Amino acid sequence: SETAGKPIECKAAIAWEAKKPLEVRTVTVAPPGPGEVRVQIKATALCQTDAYTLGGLDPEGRFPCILGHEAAGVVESVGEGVTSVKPGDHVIPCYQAYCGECKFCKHPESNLCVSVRAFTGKGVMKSDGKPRFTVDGKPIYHFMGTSTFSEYTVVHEQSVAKIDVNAPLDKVCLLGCGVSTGWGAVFNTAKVTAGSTVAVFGLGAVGLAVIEAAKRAGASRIIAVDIDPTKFPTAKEFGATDCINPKDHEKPIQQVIVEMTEWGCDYTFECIGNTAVMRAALECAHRGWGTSVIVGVAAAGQEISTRPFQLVTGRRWMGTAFGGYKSRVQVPDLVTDYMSGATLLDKYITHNMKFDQINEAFELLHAGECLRCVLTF
Amino acid sequence: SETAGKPIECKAAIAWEAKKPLEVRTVTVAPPGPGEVRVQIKATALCQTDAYTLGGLDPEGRFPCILGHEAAGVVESVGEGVTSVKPGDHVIPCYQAYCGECKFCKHPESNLCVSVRAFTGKGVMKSDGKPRFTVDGKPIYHFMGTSTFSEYTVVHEQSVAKIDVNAPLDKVCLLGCGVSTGWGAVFNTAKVTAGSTVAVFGLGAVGLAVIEAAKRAGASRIIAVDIDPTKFPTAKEFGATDCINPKDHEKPIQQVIVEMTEWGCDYTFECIGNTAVMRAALECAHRGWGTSVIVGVAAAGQEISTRPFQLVTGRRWMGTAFGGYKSRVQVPDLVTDYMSGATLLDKYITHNMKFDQINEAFELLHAGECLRCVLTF
Numbered sequence: 001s002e003t004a005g006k007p008i009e010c011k012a013a014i015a016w017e018a019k020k021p022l023e024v025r026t027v028t029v030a031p032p033g034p035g036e037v038r039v040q041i042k043a044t045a046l047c048q049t050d051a052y053t054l055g056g057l058d059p060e061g062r063f064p065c066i067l068g069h070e071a072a073g074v075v076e077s078v079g080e081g082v083t084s085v086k087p088g089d090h091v092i093p094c095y096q097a098y099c100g101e102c103k104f105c106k107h108p109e110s111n112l113c114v115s116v117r118a119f120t121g122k123g124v125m126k127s128d129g130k131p132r133f134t135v136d137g138k139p140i141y142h143f144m145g146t147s148t149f150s151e152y153t154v155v156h157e158q159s160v161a162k163i164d165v166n167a168p169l170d171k172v173c174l175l176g177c178g179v180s181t182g183w184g185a186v187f188n189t190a191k192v193t194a195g196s197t198v199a200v201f202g203l204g205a206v207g208l209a210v211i212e213a214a215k216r217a218g219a220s221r222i223i224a225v226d227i228d229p230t231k232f233p234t235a236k237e238f239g240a241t242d243c244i245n246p247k248d249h250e251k252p253i254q255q256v257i258v259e260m261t262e263w264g265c266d267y268t269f270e271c272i273g274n275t276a277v278m279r280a281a282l283e284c285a286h287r288g289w290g291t292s293v294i295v296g297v298a299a300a301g302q303e304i305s306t307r308p309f310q311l312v313t314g315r316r317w318m319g320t321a322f323g324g325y326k327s328r329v330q331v332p333d334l335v336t337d338y339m340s341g342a343t344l345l346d347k348y349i350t351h352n353m354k355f356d357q358i359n360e361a362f363e364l365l366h367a368g369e370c371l372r373c374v375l376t377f
Numbered sequence: 378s379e380t381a382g383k384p385i386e387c388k389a390a391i392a393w394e395a396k397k398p399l400e401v402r403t404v405t406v407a408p409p410g411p412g413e414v415r416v417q418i419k420a421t422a423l424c425q426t427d428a429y430t431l432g433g434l435d436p437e438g439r440f441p442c443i444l445g446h447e448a449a450g451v452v453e454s455v456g457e458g459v460t461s462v463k464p465g466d467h468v469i470p471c472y473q474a475y476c477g478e479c480k481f482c483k484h485p486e487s488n489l490c491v492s493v494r495a496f497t498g499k500g501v502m503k504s505d506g507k508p509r510f511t512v513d514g515k516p517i518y519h520f521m522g523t524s525t526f527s528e529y530t531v532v533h534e535q536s537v538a539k540i541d542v543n544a545p546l547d548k549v550c551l552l553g554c555g556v557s558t559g560w561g562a563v564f565n566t567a568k569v570t571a572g573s574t575v576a577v578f579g580l581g582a583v584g585l586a587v588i589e590a591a592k593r594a595g596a597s598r599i600i601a602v603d604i605d606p607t608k609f610p611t612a613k614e615f616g617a618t619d620c621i622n623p624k625d626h627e628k629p630i631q632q633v634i635v636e637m638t639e640w641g642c643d644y645t646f647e648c649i650g651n652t653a654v655m656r657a658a659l660e661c662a663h664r665g666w667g668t669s670v671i672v673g674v675a676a677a678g679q680e681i682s683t684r685p686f687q688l689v690t691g692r693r694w695m696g697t698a699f700g701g702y703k704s705r706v707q708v709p710d711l712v713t714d715y716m717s718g719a720t721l722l723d724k725y726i727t728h729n730m731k732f733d734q735i736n737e738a739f740e741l742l743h744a745g746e747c748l749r750c751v752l753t754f
């Protein structure tokens with residue numbers, strides 16, 4: 001290789017501080033240490049989670065840092081000990097790691113690996129406790145263990161899903177977070193049964209993925225809820241049978257849903273990050289057995305509340321992280337399902353832009369005018 | 378019966394108004410109307426739910442009424458169209474009805490029948506909207522559809538479980554309330570798996586039932602929690618492996634439980650009715666997959682709260698009503714199970730008193746060190 005074992009200077013987008021636009025400039029990327037993989041990002045999308053940390057809403061937010069966590073790329077080089085990937089492998093770096101040996105990797109119902117979170121949560125690497133990015137010798141920190149807003153990033157081996165080398169990297173970049181989360185919320189967390197009724201709160205890429213998955217699960221009714229009705233036509237494309245704007249009703253939205261379904265929907269999904277809506281989604285879960293799945297990420301500190309009578313009379317409050325998918329094991333399975341022609345993944349990409357316009361993409365998502373914006377270098 | 382078709386003069390305990398003692402006196406019990414059943418009560422227990430309504434705290438409280446909801450007895454006569462029981466059958470009347478045709482009776486994960494609940498909640502019968510008790514020709518209202526503090530009571534057919542004629546009625550009287558509820562919270566709601574860890578908050582009859590069922594399910598560790606340490610010895614006999622008094626510790630009790638189990642317990646149960654402790658039970662459920670079952674009934678105007686991060690990181694919040702048991706279907710199975718010698722049901726009866734002493738029995742309940750006290754006439 002031409003770059004293996006040596007630093008790489010490449011284009012990236014740095015967040016020097018919160019609530020400021022990113023600076024697209026050159027950074028230096030160190031070679032991978034033991035158990036690490038240096039990846040050449042080929043495509044990367046913006047998620048609402050990136051704007052969440054950029055807006056100062058992350059308690060563990062550490063600046064300066066390279067954001068980004070929805071990407072697909074090619075292995076440029078690996079550090080010593082790395083056996084699972086090799087240069088040339090097509091990969092998807094995942095915020096959720098997989099070690100196969102911790103208690104959560106071994107449990108059938110969890111994907112919350114603890115192999116590297118103590119370091120990825122701090123924006124550093126496990127091998128030496130430091131980051132791999134510098135600018136004029138000063139350290140720039142990692143984000144969600146991925147930091148995909150850079151031509152080359154360095155990640156832990158446990159965070160690297162090896163995927164079908166023939167899958168288009170600018171489409172499956174979405175499988176690193178949002179769309180996978182919405183799908184697994186249906187298939188893994190809720191396990192929607194055929195015939196069921198569903199309510200989805202928030203119609204971004206995540207909520208639309210809940211709708212697509214619930215459709216595929218055989219749901220007989222899917223109520224799409226959003227305060228922005230310009231997202232309704234796409235929601236009906238994915239399979240929504242009803243679209244509801246909360247601002248068209250003086251009743252609370254959970255009362256509206258209950259009246260449409262007498263007792264509530266068998267499953268409800270919150271895909272916003274609004275604690276008042278999370279409460280609403282649980283209270284319009286069906287009496288006796290309804291399930292509500294929190295998908296959105298609320299601002300740190302905020303609390304959800306309900307009357308305990310809601311759970312005593314049969315409703316179930318749960319949440320999901322990355323759809324319950326064990327990353328390195330199951331992300332390749334999602335790529336395989338994409339390559340089989342069975343998904344609507346291509347429909348989630350509303351804009352393809354160059355990496356230099358990353359800030360316009362952030363304005364697109366703050367304005368609700370995009371689903372997923374895929375950046376290429 | 379030579380009482381069939383006729384009113385019956387029998388002894389009962391009348392609650393004329395709130396916060397005053399019951400009067401033990403004769404009452405007139407009308408014959409059973411269409412779809413109604415008249416039961417000779419052979420044994421009836423007390424619990425805190427009776428004392429809650431008697432104390433004037435119940436917003437649905439209706440006086441004068443006849444309290445009592447834990448009982449077993451024999452059918453004296455049946456009203457028009459009743460075929461599920463006949464005179465002489467041994468029965469348990471249940472607050473939780475089963476009609477076998479509404480949405481909830483037909484769902485495998487619910488037992489919240491709506492056949493008669495709107496009428497029992499108002500202390501009247503469904504056939505005509507009127508009660509069946511009179512003193513001096515003026516009406517006495519029912520309680521929880523059972524009104525078991527009476528030698529004879531009239532109940533809806535949907536509330537009448539038909540049980541093994543061989544079962545002792547002064548023991549199976551408990552199967553209509555807290556013991557079944559705690560058992561079912563484990564077997565039906567949580568579905569506690571073999572080898573799992575369990576935490577129980579509150580060590581009355583309900584929590585002790587949770588402990589007994591969890592041990593029977595194969596739980597490898599059972600942590601009993603109560604601010605009254607005098608409940609610990611009995612918690613250990615039912616199968617507790619640890620006992621924790623929250624007041625002995627200077628950290629939040631959920632942090633105590635998590636430190637004892639590194640990540641939390643696989644299952645936790647709130648058996649008190651305390652929203653603060655409900656949140657504590659949720660937050661010491663195991664990371665990634667822990668389940669917390671609210672069993673206790675909180676006071677009015679109280680809400681449960683947590684940070685949604687707790688659910689996004691894999692914890693599940695649910696509740697139970699009557700342990701999820703479909704009453705007329707499954708209460709007979711609980712009796713059969715008790716007759717098999719598999720349960721500690723007899724160990725929940727700490728006191729046996731005569732019905733004339735009902736007021737003294739209530740004072741024992743208010744003092745404590747009484748799990749269940751059974752009254753016979």
Ligand SMILES: NC(=O)c1ccc[n+]([C@@H]2O[C@H](COP(=O)([O-])OP(=O)(O)OC[C@H]3O[C@@H](n4cnc5c(N)ncnc54)[C@H](O)[C@@H]3O)[C@@H](O)[C@H]2O)c1
Nearest residue numbers: 048202203204205206226227228271272273296297321322
């Ligand atoms: N649990 C996880 O692992 C995970 C993974 C990825 C994303 N998320 C979170 O899920 C959420 C959705 O992600 P996204 O990319 O689709 O964001 P998005 O901004 O593209 O979509 C959110 C939608 O919610 C709508 N909305 C806002 N407030 C509303 C309200 N009161 N009522 C109804 N609709 C409302 C908005 O109009 C918007 O269309 C985000 O909070 C994200 O952080 C969680």
Ligand SMILES: NC(=O)c1ccc[n+]([C@@H]2O[C@H](COP(=O)([O-])OP(=O)(O)OC[C@H]3O[C@@H](n4cnc5c(N)ncnc54)[C@H](O)[C@@H]3O)[C@@H](O)[C@H]2O)c1
Nearest residue numbers: 579580581582583603604605648649650673674697698699
């Ligand atoms: N879901 C149902 O269908 C159903 C059925 C029956 C009873 N319940 C409810 O279950 C609950 C328990 O029933 P019970 O008969 O055992 O009542 P109980 O009063 O006999 O037992 C309550 C126990 O909780 C302990 N306790 C009180 N506050 C505590 C605290 N902060 N921390 C730890 N322990 C505390 C008390 O010391 C006591 O031992 C009640 O709320 C009851 O209404 C529900």
Ligand SMILES: [Cl-]
Nearest residue numbers: 300301684686
């Ligand atoms: Cl938080």
Ligand SMILES: [Cl-]
Nearest residue numbers: 183213216343
């Ligand atoms: Cl799919």
Ligand SMILES: [Mg+2]
Nearest residue numbers: 095096177322
């Ligand atoms: Mg993720």
Ligand SMILES: [Zn+2]
Nearest residue numbers: 099102105113
């Ligand atoms: Zn792991």
Ligand SMILES: [Zn+2]
Nearest residue numbers: 047049177178
């Ligand atoms: Zn994301």
Ligand SMILES: [Zn+2]
Nearest residue numbers: 424426554555
């Ligand atoms: Zn009771």
Ligand SMILES: [Zn+2]
Nearest residue numbers: 476479482490
């Ligand atoms: Zn019913």
